[PDB]
Design an enzyme around this catalytic site. Structure first.
Site, PDB file in Angstrom:
ATOM      1  N   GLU A 158       0.767  -1.235   0.000  1.00 44.57           N
ATOM      2  CA  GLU A 158       0.000   0.000   0.000  1.00 44.57           C
ATOM      3  C   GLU A 158       0.804   1.294   0.000  1.00 44.57           C
ATOM      4  O   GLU A 158       0.476   2.217  -0.748  1.00 44.57           O
ATOM      5  CB  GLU A 158      -0.968   0.008   1.189  1.00 44.57           C
ATOM      6  N   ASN A 215      -7.055   8.369  -5.056  1.00 41.86           N
ATOM      7  CA  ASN A 215      -7.600   7.102  -5.525  1.00 41.86           C
ATOM      8  C   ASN A 215      -8.599   7.150  -6.677  1.00 41.86           C
ATOM      9  O   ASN A 215      -9.120   8.206  -7.040  1.00 41.86           O
ATOM     10  CB  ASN A 215      -8.201   6.329  -4.343  1.00 41.86           C
ATOM     11  N   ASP A 236     -11.537   6.332  -6.780  1.00 42.04           N
ATOM     12  CA  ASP A 236     -12.904   6.645  -6.385  1.00 42.04           C
ATOM     13  C   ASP A 236     -13.108   8.131  -6.148  1.00 42.04           C
ATOM     14  O   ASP A 236     -14.179   8.559  -5.730  1.00 42.04           O
ATOM     15  CB  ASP A 236     -13.303   5.857  -5.137  1.00 42.04           C
ATOM     16  N   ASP A 270      -6.235   8.584  -0.180  1.00 46.11           N
ATOM     17  CA  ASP A 270      -5.784   7.548   0.749  1.00 46.11           C
ATOM     18  C   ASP A 270      -4.642   8.147   1.560  1.00 46.11           C
ATOM     19  O   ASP A 270      -3.760   8.801   1.000  1.00 46.11           O
ATOM     20  CB  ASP A 270      -5.293   6.306  -0.010  1.00 46.11           C
TER      21      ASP A 270
END
Lengths: 129, 129
Positions: free
Chosen positions: A35, A46, A48, A52
């Site tokens: 990550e 991100n 979406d 993050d």
């Protein structure tokens, strides 16, 4: 801050992540590597539309508030900036909420696709914790 | 306030330009590299042979550890140079001898000196043995 592998493993253990929700310490270290490469200050815009944050790349749409994400739910009840600290306390506390939300570590697609079902102990093997 | 991250630097016309020019020539550029996607921590400042540089970083979303990008932007926004580092998903000896399995790709035709600068930055990673 970019943690050393064993250094992080030890810190997560101190914060009670070892075996938390049935997940061994190795799972957490593996997830963090894929990550963020253990970087507490890393942020990603991100797919979406949100951001993050931190070592475990926790998003601002559901978990933390950064004041720039519409519909934010701030389920961890914390500012995203707290997830960028050299002290991983805030990131661990939020991670515990995420993993207890009902889907375990599957919440992290990186863990699900890259760590789940592998020899996760390999990430702590040699740290002599 | 933190130094700008990669995407923030690319928000300025000067840096965006040197950034675009940097890819002039190379082929098969990875999408995450091309779009400057992924986790990024605050950039740092450094000088080489009397010239100021701004060093930025990024890595592939959800595969950060094994796919990184280090970029050296010339302070006088005259040019930019990059180093893409690829590691294999063999979490065994690769975890302790990264350099031995790493693949490097250079962008912008960096001089020997700039190459040294970028490699040194990569090597600053606590886990780069």
């Amino acid at each position: 801050k970019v943690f050393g592998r064993c250094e992080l493993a030890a810190a997560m253990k101190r914060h009670g992540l070892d075996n938390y929700r049935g997940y061994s310490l190795g799972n957490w270290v593996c997830a963090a590597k894929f990550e963020s490469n253990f970087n507490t200050q890393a942020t990603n815009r991100n797919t979406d539309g949100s951001t993050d944050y931190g070592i475990l790349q926790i998003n601002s749409r559901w978990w933390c508030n950064d004041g720039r994400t519409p519909g934010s739910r701030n389920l961890c009840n914390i500012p995203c900036s707290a997830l960028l600290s050299s002290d991983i306390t805030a990131s661990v506390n939020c991670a515990k909420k995420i993993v207890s939300d009902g889907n375990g570590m599957n919440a992290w697609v990186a863990w699900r696709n890259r760590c789940k079902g592998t020899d996760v102990q390999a990430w702590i093997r040699g740290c002599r914790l | 306030e933190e130094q700008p991250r990669l995407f923030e630097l690319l928000g300025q016309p000067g840096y965006k330009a040197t950034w675009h020019a940097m890819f002039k020539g190379e082929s098969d550029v990875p999408k995450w590299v091309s779009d400057a996607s992924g986790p990024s921590s605050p950039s740092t400042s450094l000088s080489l042979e009397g010239q100021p540089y701004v060093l930025a970083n990024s890595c592939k979303p959800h595969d950060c550890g094994n796919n990184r990008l280090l970029v050296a932007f010339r302070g006088d926004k005259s040019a930019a140079y990059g180093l893409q580092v690829s590691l294999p998903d063999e979490p065994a000896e690769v975890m302790q001898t990264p350099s031995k399995y790493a693949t490097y790709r250079w962008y912008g035709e960096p001089s020997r000196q700039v190459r040294e600068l970028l490699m040194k930055q990569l090597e600053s990673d606590p886990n780069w043995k």
